[PDB]
Design a protein around this ligand. Structure first.
Ligand SMILES: *[C@@H]1O[C@H](CO)[C@@H](O[C@@H]2O[C@H](CO)[C@@H](O[C@@H]3O[C@H](CO[C@H]4O[C@H](CO)[C@@H](O)[C@H](O[C@H]5O[C@H](CO)[C@@H](O)[C@H](O)[C@@H]5O[C@H]5O[C@H](CO)[C@@H](O)[C@H](O)[C@@H]5O)[C@@H]4O)[C@@H](O)[C@H](O[C@H]4O[C@H](CO)[C@@H](O)[C@H](O)[C@@H]4O[C@H]4O[C@H](CO)[C@@H](O)[C@H](O)[C@@H]4O)[C@@H]3O)[C@H](O)[C@H]2NC(C)=O)[C@H](O)[C@H]1NC(C)=O
Ligand SMILES: Cc1cc(OC(F)(F)F)ccc1COC(=O)N1CCn2nc(C(=O)N3CCc4[nH]nnc4C3)cc2C1
Ligand SMILES: [Ca+2]
Ligand SMILES: [Ca+2]
Ligand SMILES: [Cl-]
Ligand SMILES: [K+]
Ligand code: NA
Ligand SMILES: [Zn+2]
Length: 806
């Protein structure tokens, strides 16, 4: 109940929320049906429109007007945004040349430049160029401030997951808003767009910017605007808030536009009807900037123009129906659309089997426009698994398509021409970023980055300490003129051992054999130096990774590669090697096909053994430094050391072998040498973070040899590819992947064909940031380069997406 008998007199858009049943006057009351009787009358005035006209100038203050052109309006802070242009001969902000804002130019009593976030729903990245003619205000912001060609949203590329990611710096899996629709089995409760349950605090995890500000004494305008409140009114309210007394005035503000998303759903991303909503957004930006200029705040405030996601073409006829695949269609609940989430309709149904559901959806039709996954097998880059609200079964839907349960669900629930929600690597889903203000750089283009990074920066902009989040703090320092955050490299927790030769061949009983018994200080003084690390400068280019957790490991040196070998996990945590453009691919000699050799630097008790692999009918093995890339017949024997061995399903060996035999050389050719760091990943609880030994759910049979869930590689070269990887004088270029270590190739529908038709495509799907690999391994890469740490942080957040140009 709300006793709405009180009044909004003088309380219009009050910054503090009074406790019911007292009537409210804040910009959220509409969505609660708790506004005072007079809210519309007093707080939502519309009389006379939004602009001053020539004959309104100098008028007598008439309180019924939506905004004012009277003389006292500046002091009252409630002029129409175009007042000075019409009545005082001022020019529009857009018509002014831009001038570098070297320092905040703020009125007395402003303790810090305010931050205004102007967020636009469905603003596809390519609108910046494609709509440039009809958006002069946005275009000045863009070219005069700091801009990226695009900003990468989070998966799923829906509104609430993305806006809440912007506000928290967290992946949906951590903030909890994992879709526009959700079921939480622990609450036994459902979250919906329409409805009231979504206003319950328990859905919303992490700590959004407005709470971070508030707890640290920085006042915030409210972020959520009711749909019925017109854009012009939202602008004037922000401007009014900015005219408040120093002690009452917020420092951070948000504006939100439902457009161009709203129109985009109806008309498609480039429907002719899209021009108008883009003009209108630009007009709103103009009004904000004119209002700021009126208040002498246009060289004081930092403005962020940011979208949540793009928009793709999607029509009713491009819909896959689960009823064309499943006989048991009525025993499942589907969260439908641009992604699919499946669970059992009833928990009392013990005949529901996810395994057989997945099988029935796997490569069943030639051009099938969705792919089923168990959530832990989704590409790690999506970070979409560690939350009880994410169903075990997931469908990644092809761009331009929908998935639905039954045809009736489509024609009884074509309407739409656009939608979004797809994989966050899809060009059509990319959105925008522009920063303009004293704290951002002048006329600067920055590389694309992820929206998870913005929280940190908005914290920097407001002098706040960010709550723990998924951004990498410092990776966006190159956006900022000042207020940079100077991060320091994490301290190494474990130091390596450096074992020499300590064991005789005969101390090993591993059931391994090798045809290697063939024999001179020419080639023996030489091989000593290689095992002490004489070629280490070539194969270990950026210093050894640091181990950021407590463990026992050995640095092992070799002619062709260096490794950090875990005595705990019985394999390298990392294997580093350099392949020059000139390097040659050889095959494995017939006599050495099954060759595995004990490593005399490492005890039998800390080694794998061949027997376990013989007994395990499911599990074979591969090597991290590839035998094919050995520098010499003699060097090749090193690649067969038991300490270079890792467990691999035969199905995965097809993938790995093609990577090592074909792709590494190809990348070396194309990139002028590559440095490769490869290794295992263990993430059995799919939390994106390195497993402790007690979290491993699978071993090679009859052994303590743990089975990785994934294999990674980080592939680094010179950004200036006219320089070789091993002699680079400037910025680096990287591409990485985290390949799932699976017993089958069910994910690849073409896998019965040659590796040259499917493997690289799989790898591309599982592209990763070095930073993702850091979370998963507890290692820290690039410790010793000539590059600034901030640039390295940027490099570590880079994702090679394999899409076309935007
Ligand atoms: C992206 O960034 C985020 C933020 O940094 C990273 O997430 C953090 O990871 C930490 C490590 O996993 C984790 O720390 C744990 O916190 C536990 C208490 O956490 C509560 O309090 C915090 C602070 O206010 C709060 O943020 C948490 O909020 C979570 O849960 C609520 C309610 O469920 C949600 O509203 C909210 O959205 C959030 O949910 C998410 O996180 C939880 C895990 O906390 C997931 O389960 C969800 O799926 C969802 O993703 C909490 O309210 C604390 O109890 C933990 O301590 C246990 O483990 C340590 C190991 O060191 C051990 O020493 C302790 O003894 C203890 O073990 C006991 O519990 C075990 C399990 O129940 C049991 O087995 C043992 O026997 C013991 O009894 C731990 O310290 C931190 O909470 C999250 N923070 C957030 C916001 O998610 C994330 O990792 C980053 N991602 C990547 C890829 O880098
Ligand atoms: C939470 C945050 C952080 C920001 O930025 C940051 F945190 F990054 F700083 C910015 C804004 C915000 C919040 O934004 C808002 O004010 N609202 C949240 C989004 N929202 N959606 C609606 C809605 O009902 N629909 C509009 C879209 C649409 N299209 N078709 N149908 C619909 C139906 C109303 C609102 C109000
Ligand atoms: Ca949206
Ligand atoms: Ca884990
Ligand atoms: Cl969803
Ligand atoms: K085997
Ligand atoms: Na297959
Ligand atoms: Zn939408």
């Amino acid at each position: 109940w709300t006793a709405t008998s009180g009044s909004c007199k003088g309380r219009c858009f009050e910054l503090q929320e009074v406790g019911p049943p007292d009537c409210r006057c804040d910009n959220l009351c509409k969505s609660y049906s708790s506004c005072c009787h007079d809210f519309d009358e007093l707080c939502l005035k519309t009389a006379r429109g939004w602009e001053c006209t020539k004959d309104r100038c100098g008028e007598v203050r008439n309180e019924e007007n939506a905004c004012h052109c009277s003389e006292d309006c500046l002091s009252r802070g409630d002029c129409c945004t175009n007042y000075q242009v019409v009545c005082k001969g001022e020019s529009h902000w857009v018509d002014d040349d831009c001038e570098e804002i070297k320092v905040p130019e703020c009125p007395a009593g402003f303790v810090r430049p305010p931050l205004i976030i102007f967020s636009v729903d469905g603003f596809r990245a390519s609108y910046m160029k494609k709509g440039s003619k009809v958006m002069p205000n946005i275009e000045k912001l863009r070219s005069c401030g700091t801009h990226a060609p695009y900003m990468r949203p989070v998966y799923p590329t829906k509104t609430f997951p993305n806006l809440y990611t912007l506000a928290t710096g967290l992946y949906p899996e951590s903030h909890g808003i994992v879709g526009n629709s959700m079921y939480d089995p622990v609450f036994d409760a459902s979250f919906h767009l329409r409805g009231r349950e979504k206003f319950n605090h328990r859905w919303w995890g992490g700590q959004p910017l407005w709470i971070t500000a508030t707890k640290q004494g920085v006042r915030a305008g409210t972020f959520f605007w009711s749909v019925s409140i017109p854009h012009e009114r939202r602008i004037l309210t922000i401007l009014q808030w900015l005219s408040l007394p120093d002690n009452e005035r917020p420092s951070v503000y948000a504006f939100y536009s439902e457009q161009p998303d709203f129109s985009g759903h109806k008309y498609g991303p480039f429907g002719p009807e899209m021009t108008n909503p883009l003009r209108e957004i630009d007009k709103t930006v103009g009004q904000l900037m004119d209002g700021l200029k009126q208040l002498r705040l246009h060289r004081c405030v930092n403005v962020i123009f940011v979208g949540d996601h793009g928009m793709e073409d999607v029509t009713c006829d491009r819909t896959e129906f689960l009823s064309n695949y499943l006989t048991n269609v009525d025993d499942i609940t589907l969260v439908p659309g641009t992604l699919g989430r499946i669970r059992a309709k009833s928990i009392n149904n013990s005949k529901y089997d996810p395994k057989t559901i997945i099988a029935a959806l796997t490569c069943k039709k030639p051009d099938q426009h969705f792919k089923p996954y168990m959530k832990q097998h989704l590409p790690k880059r999506l970070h979409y698994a560690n939350n009880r609200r994410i169903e075990d079964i997931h469908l990644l839907v092809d761009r331009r398509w929908h998935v639905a349960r039954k045809p009736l669900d489509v024609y009884k629930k074509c309407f739409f021409q656009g939608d979004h929600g797809f994989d966050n690597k899809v060009n059509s889903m990319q959105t925008v970023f522009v920063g303009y203000g004293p704290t951002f750089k002048y006329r600067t283009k920055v590389p694309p980055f992820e929206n998870i990074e913005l929280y940190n920066v908005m914290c920097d902009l407001l002098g706040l300490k960010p709550a723990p989040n998924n951004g990498t703090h410092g990776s966006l320092n190159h956006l900022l003129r000042t207020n940079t955050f100077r991060p320091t490299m994490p301290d190494e927790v474990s130091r390596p051992n450096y074992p020499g030769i300590m064991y005789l061949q005969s101390e090993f009983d591993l059931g391994c054999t090798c045809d290697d018994k063939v024999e001179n200080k020419l080639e023996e003084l030489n091989k000593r130096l290689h095992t002490k690390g004489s070629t280490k400068e070539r194969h270990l280019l950026y210093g050894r990774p640091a181990v950021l957790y407590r463990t026992s490991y050995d640095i092992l040196y070799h002619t062709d590669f260096e490794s950090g070998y875990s005595e705990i996990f019985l394999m390298p945590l990392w294997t580093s090697y350099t392949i020059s453009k000139q390097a040659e691919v050889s095959s494995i000699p017939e006599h050495l096909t099954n060759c595995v050799r004990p490593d005399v630097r490492v005890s039998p008790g800390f080694s794998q053994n061949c027997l376990a692999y013989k007994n395990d009918k499911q599990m074979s093995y591969g090597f991290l430094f590839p035998p094919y890339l050995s520098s010499s017949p003699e060097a090749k024997y090193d690649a067969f050391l038991v300490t270079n061995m890792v467990p691999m399903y035969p199905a995965f060996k097809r993938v790995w072998a093609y990577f090592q035999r074909v792709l590494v050389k190809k990348y070396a050719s194309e990139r002028n040498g590559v440095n490769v760091i490869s290794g295992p990943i263990f993430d059995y609880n799919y939390d994106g973070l390195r497993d402790t030994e007690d979290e491993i759910k699978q071993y090679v049979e009859g052994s303590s040899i743990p089975v990785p869930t994934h294999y990674y590689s980080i592939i680094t070269s010179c950004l200036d590819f006219t320089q070789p990887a091993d002699k680079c004088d400037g910025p680096l270029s990287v591409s990485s992947f985290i390949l799932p270590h699976r017993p089958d190739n069910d994910e690849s529908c073409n896998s019965s064909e040659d590796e040259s038709k499917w493997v690289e495509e799989l790898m591309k799907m599982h592209t990763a940031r070095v930073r993702d690999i850091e979370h998963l391994t507890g290692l820290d890469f690039y410790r010793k380069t000539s590059r600034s740490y901030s640039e390295i942080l940027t490099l570590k957040t880079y994702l090679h997406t394999y899409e076309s140009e935007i």
